Coordinates of C-alpha atoms in Angstrom, one line a residue:
Chain A
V1 CA -18.5 -6.5 17.7
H2 CA -17.5 -8.3 15.2
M3 CA -16.0 -5.2 13.4
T4 CA -14.3 -5.5 10.0
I5 CA -12.0 -2.5 8.5
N6 CA -11.4 -2.9 4.7
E7 CA -9.2 0.2 4.5
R8 CA -7.1 1.7 7.6
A9 CA -5.9 4.5 5.2
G10 CA -8.3 7.8 7.2
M11 CA -8.2 6.5 10.8
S12 CA -7.3 8.6 13.4
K13 CA -4.7 7.7 16.0
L14 CA -7.4 8.3 18.6
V15 CA -10.3 6.0 16.8
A16 CA -7.0 2.9 16.6
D17 CA -6.4 3.1 20.0
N18 CA -10.1 3.1 21.0
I19 CA -10.6 -0.1 18.8
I20 CA -7.9 -2.1 20.2
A21 CA -9.4 -0.8 23.7
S22 CA -12.2 -2.6 22.7
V23 CA -11.5 -5.4 21.7
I24 CA -9.4 -5.8 24.8
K25 CA -12.3 -4.6 27.2
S26 CA -15.7 -5.3 24.7
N27 CA -14.3 -8.3 23.8
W28 CA -14.8 -7.2 20.2
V29 CA -13.2 -9.3 17.1
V30 CA -11.7 -6.9 14.4
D31 CA -11.2 -8.4 11.0
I32 CA -8.3 -5.8 9.5
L33 CA -8.6 -7.0 5.4
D34 CA -6.1 -3.9 4.1
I35 CA -3.0 -5.6 5.8
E36 CA -1.1 -7.8 3.7
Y37 CA 2.0 -10.1 4.8
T38 CA 4.6 -13.0 4.6
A39 CA 4.2 -15.1 7.4
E40 CA 7.7 -17.2 9.3
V41 CA 6.1 -20.1 11.2
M42 CA 8.4 -20.3 14.6
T43 CA 9.3 -23.4 15.9
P44 CA 8.5 -23.0 20.5
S45 CA 13.4 -23.0 20.4
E46 CA 12.9 -20.3 18.5
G47 CA 10.9 -17.7 19.7
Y48 CA 9.1 -14.6 18.2
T49 CA 12.2 -13.1 17.1
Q50 CA 10.1 -9.8 15.6
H51 CA 7.4 -7.9 17.1
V52 CA 4.2 -5.9 16.3
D53 CA 2.5 -3.5 18.5
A54 CA -0.9 -3.1 17.9
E55 CA -0.5 1.0 17.1
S56 CA 1.8 0.0 13.7
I57 CA -0.6 -3.0 12.5
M58 CA -3.3 -0.2 12.6
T59 CA -0.9 2.5 11.3
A60 CA 1.2 1.3 8.6
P61 CA 1.3 2.1 5.2
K62 CA -1.4 0.2 2.8
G63 CA 0.8 -1.5 -0.1
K64 CA 3.6 -2.8 2.8
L65 CA 4.5 -6.0 3.1
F66 CA 4.3 -7.4 7.1
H67 CA 6.4 -10.0 8.3
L68 CA 4.3 -11.8 11.3
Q69 CA 4.8 -14.6 13.0
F70 CA 3.5 -18.0 13.7
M71 CA 4.4 -20.4 17.0
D72 CA 3.9 -24.2 16.2
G73 CA 3.4 -24.8 19.7
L74 CA 3.0 -28.6 19.2
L75 CA 6.5 -29.6 20.1
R76 CA 6.5 -28.1 23.2
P77 CA 6.8 -30.6 25.6
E78 CA 5.0 -31.4 29.3
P79 CA 5.7 -28.8 32.2
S80 CA 7.4 -30.8 35.0
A81 CA 4.9 -32.1 37.9
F82 CA 6.5 -29.7 40.2
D83 CA 7.1 -26.6 38.0
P84 CA 5.5 -23.7 40.2
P85 CA 1.8 -22.5 38.5
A86 CA 1.6 -19.5 36.3
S87 CA -0.7 -17.3 38.4
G88 CA -1.2 -14.6 35.9
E89 CA -2.1 -15.6 31.1
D90 CA -0.3 -15.5 28.3
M91 CA -2.0 -13.3 25.4
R92 CA -2.6 -13.5 22.1
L93 CA -4.2 -10.7 20.1
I94 CA -2.8 -11.3 16.2
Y95 CA -4.6 -14.2 14.0
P96 CA -4.0 -15.2 10.3
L97 CA -7.9 -14.9 8.0
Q98 CA -6.7 -18.3 6.5
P99 CA -4.2 -20.9 6.2
Chain B
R1 CA -28.0 -14.3 -10.4
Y2 CA -25.0 -15.4 -12.1
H3 CA -21.3 -16.6 -12.1
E4 CA -18.1 -15.2 -12.9
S5 CA -15.0 -17.2 -14.1
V6 CA -12.2 -17.8 -16.7
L7 CA -13.0 -19.4 -19.5
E8 CA -9.7 -20.6 -21.5
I9 CA -9.9 -20.6 -24.9
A10 CA -8.9 -23.5 -25.9
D11 CA -12.3 -25.1 -23.8
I12 CA -13.6 -22.8 -27.6
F13 CA -11.2 -23.5 -30.1
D14 CA -10.4 -27.1 -30.3
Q15 CA -7.2 -25.8 -32.8
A16 CA -4.3 -26.3 -30.6
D17 CA -2.2 -24.4 -33.2
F18 CA -3.9 -21.2 -31.8
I19 CA -3.6 -21.3 -28.0
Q20 CA 0.0 -21.1 -26.1
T21 CA -1.5 -20.1 -22.5
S22 CA -4.0 -20.7 -20.0
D23 CA -6.1 -19.5 -17.1
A24 CA -3.2 -19.2 -14.7
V25 CA -2.2 -16.0 -17.2
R26 CA -5.5 -13.7 -16.3
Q27 CA -5.2 -15.0 -13.0
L28 CA -1.1 -13.4 -12.4
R29 CA -1.9 -10.5 -14.3
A30 CA -5.0 -9.9 -11.7
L31 CA -2.5 -9.7 -9.1
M32 CA -0.5 -7.0 -10.8
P33 CA -1.5 -2.9 -10.0
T34 CA -3.1 -1.1 -12.8
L35 CA 0.3 -0.2 -14.6
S36 CA 0.9 3.7 -16.8
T37 CA 2.4 2.3 -20.2
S38 CA 5.8 4.4 -18.7
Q39 CA 4.9 1.8 -15.4
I40 CA 5.6 -1.2 -18.3
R41 CA 8.5 0.3 -20.4
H42 CA 10.4 0.1 -16.8
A43 CA 9.1 -3.3 -16.1
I44 CA 10.0 -4.1 -19.4
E45 CA 13.7 -2.0 -18.9
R46 CA 14.3 -4.1 -15.6
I47 CA 13.6 -7.6 -16.8
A48 CA 16.4 -6.0 -19.8
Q49 CA 18.1 -5.2 -16.6
Chain C
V1 CA -10.1 50.2 -8.7
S2 CA -6.5 50.6 -8.9
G3 CA -6.3 47.5 -8.0
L4 CA -8.9 46.0 -10.2
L5 CA -7.7 47.2 -12.3
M6 CA -4.0 46.0 -12.0
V7 CA -5.7 42.0 -11.7
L8 CA -7.2 42.8 -14.8
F9 CA -4.3 43.8 -16.5
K10 CA -2.1 41.4 -15.1
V11 CA -4.3 38.7 -16.3
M12 CA -5.4 40.1 -19.3
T13 CA -1.2 39.6 -19.9
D14 CA -1.2 35.9 -19.0
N15 CA 0.2 34.6 -21.5
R16 CA 1.6 31.3 -19.8
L17 CA 1.1 28.4 -21.3
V18 CA 1.6 24.9 -19.8
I19 CA 4.5 22.5 -19.6
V20 CA 4.0 19.0 -17.7
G21 CA 5.7 19.3 -14.3
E22 CA 7.3 16.8 -11.8
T23 CA 4.4 14.2 -12.1
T24 CA 4.0 10.8 -9.5
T25 CA 2.4 7.8 -10.6
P26 CA 1.5 6.0 -7.4
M27 CA 1.2 2.4 -7.3
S28 CA -2.7 1.6 -7.1
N29 CA -2.5 -0.5 -3.8
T30 CA -0.4 1.6 -1.8
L31 CA -3.4 4.7 -2.3
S32 CA -6.4 4.4 0.1
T33 CA -9.8 3.6 -2.3
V34 CA -10.7 6.7 -1.4
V35 CA -7.8 8.6 -2.9
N36 CA -7.7 5.7 -5.9
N37 CA -11.2 6.6 -6.8
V38 CA -10.4 10.3 -7.5
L39 CA -6.6 9.7 -8.6
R40 CA -6.6 9.0 -12.6
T41 CA -3.1 7.7 -12.8
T42 CA -0.5 10.6 -12.4
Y43 CA -0.7 13.3 -10.4
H44 CA 1.6 16.7 -10.6
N45 CA 4.4 16.4 -7.3
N46 CA 2.4 19.9 -7.0
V47 CA -1.2 18.8 -5.8
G48 CA -2.9 22.0 -4.9
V49 CA -5.2 21.8 -2.1
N50 CA -9.1 21.1 -2.2
Chain D
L1 CA 8.6 35.1 -35.3
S2 CA 7.0 35.5 -31.4
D3 CA 8.1 35.5 -28.1
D4 CA 4.0 34.6 -27.7
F5 CA 4.1 32.1 -24.6
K6 CA 6.0 32.0 -21.1
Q7 CA 6.2 28.0 -20.1
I8 CA 5.7 27.4 -16.9
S9 CA 5.0 23.9 -14.7
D10 CA 3.1 24.4 -12.1
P11 CA 0.9 27.3 -12.3
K12 CA -0.7 29.1 -9.6
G13 CA -4.3 30.2 -9.7
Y14 CA -5.2 33.8 -9.7
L15 CA -7.4 32.4 -6.1
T16 CA -5.8 30.4 -3.7
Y17 CA -7.6 29.0 -0.1
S18 CA -6.9 31.4 2.7
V19 CA -7.3 30.3 6.6
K20 CA -7.3 31.8 9.9
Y21 CA -7.3 29.1 12.7
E22 CA -8.3 29.0 16.1
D23 CA -4.8 28.7 18.2
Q24 CA -6.8 26.6 21.0
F25 CA -7.7 23.8 19.2
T26 CA -5.4 23.9 16.0
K27 CA -2.1 21.7 17.4
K28 CA 0.9 23.3 15.1
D29 CA 2.5 19.7 14.8
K30 CA 2.3 18.6 11.3
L31 CA -0.4 16.0 10.6
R32 CA 0.5 13.0 7.7
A33 CA -0.8 9.9 7.2
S34 CA 1.1 7.3 4.8
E35 CA 3.6 8.3 3.3
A36 CA 2.0 7.7 -0.5
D37 CA -1.9 8.9 0.1
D38 CA -0.2 12.5 2.3
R39 CA 2.0 12.8 -1.3
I40 CA -1.4 14.0 -2.7
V41 CA -4.3 14.5 0.2
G42 CA -1.4 15.7 2.4
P43 CA -1.5 19.6 1.9
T44 CA -5.2 19.8 2.0
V45 CA -5.3 17.8 4.8
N46 CA -2.7 20.6 6.8
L47 CA -4.9 23.4 5.3
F48 CA -8.2 22.2 6.7
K49 CA -6.9 21.1 10.2
Chain E
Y1 CA 13.8 -37.2 15.1
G2 CA 12.7 -33.7 16.5
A3 CA 12.2 -31.7 12.4
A4 CA 9.1 -29.2 14.3
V5 CA 7.9 -28.7 10.6
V6 CA 9.1 -29.1 6.9
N7 CA 7.9 -26.7 4.5
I8 CA 8.5 -26.6 0.4
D9 CA 10.3 -23.7 -0.8
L10 CA 11.1 -22.2 -4.0
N11 CA 15.0 -23.1 -4.4
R12 CA 16.8 -20.3 -3.3
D13 CA 19.9 -22.2 -4.6
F14 CA 18.3 -21.9 -8.5
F15 CA 15.9 -18.0 -7.7
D16 CA 18.9 -16.2 -7.1
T17 CA 19.6 -13.3 -6.4
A18 CA 20.7 -12.4 -9.9
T19 CA 17.5 -13.1 -11.2
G20 CA 17.1 -10.3 -8.8
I21 CA 14.6 -12.9 -6.8
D22 CA 15.1 -12.8 -3.4
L23 CA 13.3 -15.4 -0.9
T24 CA 14.3 -14.9 2.9
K25 CA 10.9 -15.1 3.6
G26 CA 8.5 -16.8 2.1
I27 CA 8.0 -15.8 -1.2
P28 CA 9.8 -14.4 -3.8
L29 CA 10.4 -10.7 -4.3
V30 CA 11.4 -8.3 -6.4
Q31 CA 12.9 -4.7 -6.0
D32 CA 12.1 -2.2 -9.0
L33 CA 10.0 -3.9 -11.0
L34 CA 7.1 -2.7 -10.8
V35 CA 7.4 0.8 -9.2
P36 CA 5.5 4.6 -8.8
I37 CA 7.2 6.7 -11.6
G38 CA 8.2 10.2 -9.7
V39 CA 8.7 9.0 -6.2
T40 CA 11.2 6.2 -4.5
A41 CA 9.2 3.2 -4.6
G42 CA 8.7 2.5 -0.8
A43 CA 10.7 -0.6 0.9
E44 CA 9.6 -4.3 1.6
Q45 CA 6.5 -2.7 -0.6
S46 CA 4.0 -5.6 -1.8
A47 CA 4.0 -5.5 -5.3
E48 CA 7.5 -7.1 -5.2
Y49 CA 5.4 -10.0 -4.5

């Protein structure tokens, strides 16, 4: 499903949690349009100072201004040939709809 | 089948003397929430402050 | 019957005259669209139920 | 010339809703959404919880 | 050398806190201009933009 949420305002915690769980398990794409945000563009050495759990994105009051951060990881240097393999997988949930 | 769009007064009138602004003010107003008269007064008192 | 009489009497003598009380005038963007359609600018802080 | 009226601000009605909750399914804990909406739809939401 | 990004911001030195503007984020933000009446405006409200 490519679900669009124009307005979160009535949504139960149960439903929001279920939608996120579908994003993760059923591979849903959920475009939340109600959100407004400023967007700092971090560089890899400075990391992500601020964090946003899925709950807060799904339940924040309408008309409040979120402050998301986005890595520009283009300045990440190559790994050493002898760095241990990563068995795991770094993941990401939040993306912009616009440049 | 139509296309809504801002049309500056300057594209209509050929007399520059009575045209001070442009489409930009309309766009900026579109950014504003509709304001009750007391909210307008509050804005003006704030800018005055 | 006495109770209905007193109700009726208390209504017959309801000389109340409303003055506007405390009244919020919320920013439009902060409201869910379903509430915005219903709200007409200001509303009393003591909204009742409906 | 007369004390004809009693000025009052937030009038109470003659009727009102009265609600009995089935305690097994009710959560006594107060519900709320965003403050903006709760200020309006709030007392309603809690009553007909 | 090593500049990761080069942005173009409004000059915070010019649009000072004396104008009421804050520019620590990506955008100008002014408190207490466009506000609800009868309640304190919420923090980090979008209308500030």
